[PDB]
């Protein structure tokens, strides 16, 4: 279904990368934060939900969605309840950027635009088609 997203955290250089994947397309959005917290996860979800018609979110760590602030964000936004190559691409460009956050966003760019259609083309088509 086009409203389904997966969200997980990965760790790199003592920082945390929040990665959201649109399951039907493989499109990704990510952000770098200092550490995993409910406040960060809630903020990320609210941003995501304002961009895309987000219906359901899955995760590989259920406990990360247990805070009051995260349940509040899912409530208000009407939400119900890849790190393999992404880390490959980050390593490849890591040299080219000073800050890890900059390398992560270059990696997301590369991932979303690389063709086999690209993930970014597929999300827009999947969603436009459903309107």
Q: Which of 12, 33, 77, 100 binds its own copies (CB under 8 A)?
A: 77
Binds its own copies (CB under 8 A): choice among 11, 13, 53, 61: 53
Note the Cα 70 to chain centre separation in Å. 15
- Which of 29, 57, 70, 74 is close enough to bind its own copies by CB under 8 A? 29
> What minimum distance in Å lies between the beta carbon of 14 and its own copies?
19
Can residue 113 be called a binding residue for its own copies (CB under 8 A)?
A: yes
Q: Is 19 in the site for its own copies (CB under 8 A)?
A: no
Query: For Mg ion, which stretch binds (CB under 5 A), given 14-22, 53-61, 81-89, 118-126?
Result: 53-61
For the record, the structure tokens of 73 come out as: 């964000």
């Amino acid at each position: 279904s086009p409203g389904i997203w997966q969200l997980d955290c990965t760790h790199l250089e003592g920082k945390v990368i929040l990665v959201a994947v649109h399951v039907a397309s493989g499109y990704i959005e990510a952000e770098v934060i200092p550490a995993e917290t409910g406040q960060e996860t809630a903020y990320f979800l609210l941003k995501l939900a304002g961009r895309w018609p987000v219906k359901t979110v899955h995760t590989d760590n259920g406990s990360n969605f247990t805070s009051t602030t995260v349940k509040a964000a899912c409530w208000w936004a009407g939400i119900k309840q890849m790190n393999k190559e992404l880390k490959k691409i980050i390593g490849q460009v890591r040299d080219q950027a000073e800050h890890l956050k900059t390398a992560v966003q270059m990696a997301v760019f590369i991932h979303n635009k690389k063709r086999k259609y690209s993930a970014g083309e597929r999300i827009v088509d999947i969603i436009a088609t459903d309107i």
